[PDB]
Design an enzyme around this catalytic site. Structure first.
Site, PDB file in Angstrom:
ATOM      1  CG  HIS A  41       1.022   1.863   4.031  1.00 51.51           C
ATOM      2  ND1 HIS A  41       0.136   2.635   3.458  1.00 51.51           N
ATOM      3  CD2 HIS A  41       1.183   2.270   5.281  1.00 51.51           C
ATOM      4  CE1 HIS A  41      -0.444   3.534   4.100  1.00 51.51           C
ATOM      5  NE2 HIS A  41       0.297   3.504   5.274  1.00 51.51           N
ATOM      6  N   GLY A 143       0.687   8.643  10.566  1.00 48.04           N
ATOM      7  CA  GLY A 143      -0.069   7.647  11.644  1.00 48.04           C
ATOM      8  C   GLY A 143      -1.514   7.385  11.624  1.00 48.04           C
ATOM      9  CB  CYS A 145      -2.595   5.214   6.686  1.00 48.42           C
ATOM     10  SG  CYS A 145      -1.100   4.894   7.403  1.00 48.42           S
TER      11      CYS A 145
HETATM   12  C1  LIG Z   1      -0.031   4.601   6.301  1.00 48.43           C
HETATM   13  C2  LIG Z   1       1.520   4.382   6.827  1.00 48.43           C
HETATM   14  O1  LIG Z   1       1.320   3.957   7.995  1.00 48.43           O
HETATM   15  N1  LIG Z   1       2.528   4.719   6.080  1.00 48.43           N
HETATM   16  C3  LIG Z   1       3.759   4.505   6.722  1.00 48.43           C
HETATM   17  C4  LIG Z   1       4.562   3.246   6.880  1.00 48.43           C
HETATM   18  C5  LIG Z   1       5.498   2.873   7.321  1.00 48.43           C
HETATM   19  C6  LIG Z   1       6.438   3.966   7.821  1.00 48.43           C
HETATM   20  C7  LIG Z   1       7.805   3.854   8.523  1.00 48.43           C
HETATM   21  C8  LIG Z   1       7.620   3.735  10.149  1.00 48.43           C
HETATM   22  C9  LIG Z   1       8.203   2.505   8.139  1.00 48.43           C
HETATM   23  C10 LIG Z   1       8.728   4.742   8.044  1.00 48.43           C
HETATM   24  C11 LIG Z   1       5.927   5.277   7.981  1.00 48.43           C
HETATM   25  C12 LIG Z   1       4.469   5.564   7.406  1.00 48.43           C
HETATM   26  C13 LIG Z   1       2.496   5.243   4.775  1.00 48.43           C
HETATM   27  C14 LIG Z   1       2.068   6.588   4.549  1.00 48.43           C
HETATM   28  N2  LIG Z   1       2.027   7.152   3.310  1.00 48.43           N
HETATM   29  C15 LIG Z   1       2.316   6.315   2.070  1.00 48.43           C
HETATM   30  C16 LIG Z   1       2.916   5.315   2.216  1.00 48.43           C
HETATM   31 CL1  LIG Z   1       3.331   4.112   0.976  1.00 48.43          CL
HETATM   32  C17 LIG Z   1       2.852   4.634   3.649  1.00 48.43           C
END
Ligand SMILES: *[C@@H](*)C(=O)N(c1ccc(C(C)(C)C)cc1)c1cncc(Cl)c1
Ligand SMILES: *[C@@H](*)C(=O)N(c1ccc(C(C)(C)C)cc1)c1cncc(Cl)c1
Lengths: 306, 306
Positions: A41, A143, A145
């Site tokens: 993601h 942040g 993940c």
């Molecule tokens: C894991 C992770 O980074 N994330 C996340 C991706 C993208 C964004 C935006 C900046 C586009 C808002 C935020 C968080 C994430 C966390 N939990 C679930 C999922 Cl599907 C993604």
């Protein structure tokens, strides 16, 4: 003596943590040899994360869309691919700090250490168990993940978890390092929820043995019980069944303390029916279920890692 | 979300751990630049440890009586001296893994991470608080002395604890890294005992704020209390007094949650007088006092270290 929630030393994993950025999304990656592993993601955007078509999203990317930072050093991406829910970023440099490692998938009831990271930089380390419902009660902020969970056996790091998301109850879901989710969760934004949990009975018993090894004996009693009669009580208190293999795994602890496993089951039964009556066990007023029999033997005997 | 007993990443300290042997006694040393620090009781023998004259014991030693092993590499000792209760072994090689560091002495109520080691090899990492009575409720087996406690601030390791001994209640005593014991303990075998402890009130309040940040609010109430009236209740339950400086340090957490510090004191008062009535806070059925206000802000905001 003493008994603590003890994590593995994190140094070997710290040397593998990097920062992966795609667009405005930044998260953590794991750099082993010349591959960086991270949640897929990373390629999503605020509107993409509703119901993303990851194959579609990825074919629209190039190597240069991925910036990998290992400390203050940039890693040139020379290839990319998707494996289930993780991305594999081929980089032009093998990590000279790569430990001996394995990708293993663990069972509910098993424990591991988590190195929480933000922007590729380690923040803290703590011990977690995989719940029966395939969540983990972690400590993670936005942040995180891409932070990984692991065990260490002598010199070899067995990676078992990559963090992806937080569920609405505040618990956490992620994948093994092949990108396969633990439990019935998906890397998109739905109404998914943890689902009912149970208490890990064999671990509670291991912790009671830890307590006896450490001099807490007030909960012991002369009674015993049968395995079937104990499991009737376990079911009524939302504990999972105890098997003969659990009894066998508790053999060494039973032999060290001289308390028969079924005798400790009788003690657990009384604790479930009467509560703890204002007393504590190993500094807890709750029955603790996130120590495996191995964790107890490791800490109450003293195994190191090199 | 989530809230865990979280230690600092241990990598920077792992690279400093060595094995020190004198005679048949083996323990852990800390290798920074060209000095190895270790407990002076490495020079004792089974009969020496009753009432040792350490100056006498040390003048009878030579450099060659100390074998230092850094992994599978032997460090030649070229000088030795005693500093209070630690030995300083000058070696012919500066540790290339020496982090930026400080030797700091902490206050009761303050927390740190412990890297438990055996034979110079790290075994696990966990978080500890210095108790009001200057003990720590650690997890240590024989051969752990010389393991160190530390905090990390950005890139700098502030070493604060070197483990020496276990007291009869199973708690642990040691020194700062200048060799000065925490509390009224000595490195010989007497009948020394921990002495009465108290609960770290400001930390309990910090943890209640952590709980509110994480969505546990059941213990909140509309009442308030004065600082003097709260401290009357604290004294009766063996909590230490809350000062205006404690109130001030809790300011940020108070402002983030919108719960006045004295309002949280009123909540703590009710919890002390009524117990928890079968409920839990952040997964505990006890009032937890080994998280400082800094620990809460760090974990509920997400500071990393590099
Ligand atoms: C894991 C992770 O980074 N994330 C996340 C991706 C993208 C964004 C935006 C900046 C586009 C808002 C935020 C968080 C994430 C966390 N939990 C679930 C999922 Cl599907 C993604
Ligand atoms: C810290 C430590 O090593 N130690 C200890 C020293 C010597 C021995 C013998 C092998 C000589 C029996 C055992 C343990 C120690 C631990 N706690 C208190 C003290 Cl004074 C020493």
């Amino acid at each position: 003596s003493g008994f603590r929630k003890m994590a593995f030393p994190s140094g070997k994993v710290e040397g593998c943590m990097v920062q992966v950025t795609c667009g405005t999304t930044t998260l953590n990656g794991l750099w082993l040899d010349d591959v960086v592993y991270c949640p897929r993601h990373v390629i999503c955007t605020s509107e993409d994360m509703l119901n993303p078509n990851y194959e579609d999203l990825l074919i629209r990317k190039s190597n240069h869309n991925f910036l990998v930072q290992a400390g203050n050093v940039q890693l040139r991406v020379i290839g990319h691919s998707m494996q289930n829910c993780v991305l594999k970023l081929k980089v032009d440099t093998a990590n000279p700090k790569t430990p001996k490692y394995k990708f293993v998938r663990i069972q509910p009831g098993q424990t591991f250490s988590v190195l929480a990271c933000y922007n590729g930089s380690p923040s803290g380390v703590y011990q977690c168990a995989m719940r029966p419902n395939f969540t983990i009660k972690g400590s993670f902020l936005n942040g995180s993940c891409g932070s990984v969970g692991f065990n260490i056996d002598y010199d070899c790091v067995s990676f078992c978890y990559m963090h992806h998301m937080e569920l609405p109850t505040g618990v956490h879901a992620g994948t093994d390092l092949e990108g396969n989710f633990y439990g019935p969760f998906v890397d998109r934004q739905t109404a998914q929820a943890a689902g009912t949990d149970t208490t890990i009975t064999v671990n509670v018993l291991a912790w009671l043995y830890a307590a006896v090894i450490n001099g807490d004996r007030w909960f012991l009693n002369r009674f015993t019980t049968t395995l079937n009669d104990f499991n009737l009580v376990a079911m009524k208190y939302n504990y999972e069944p105890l098997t003969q293999d659990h009894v066998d795994i508790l053999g060494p602890l039973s032999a060290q303390t001289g308390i028969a496993v079924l005798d400790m089951c009788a003690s657990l039964k009384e604790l479930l029916q009467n509560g703890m009556n204002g007393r504590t066990i190993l500094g807890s007023a709750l029955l603790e279920d996130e120590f495996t029999p191995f964790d107890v033997v490791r800490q109450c005997s003293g195994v190191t890692f090199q």
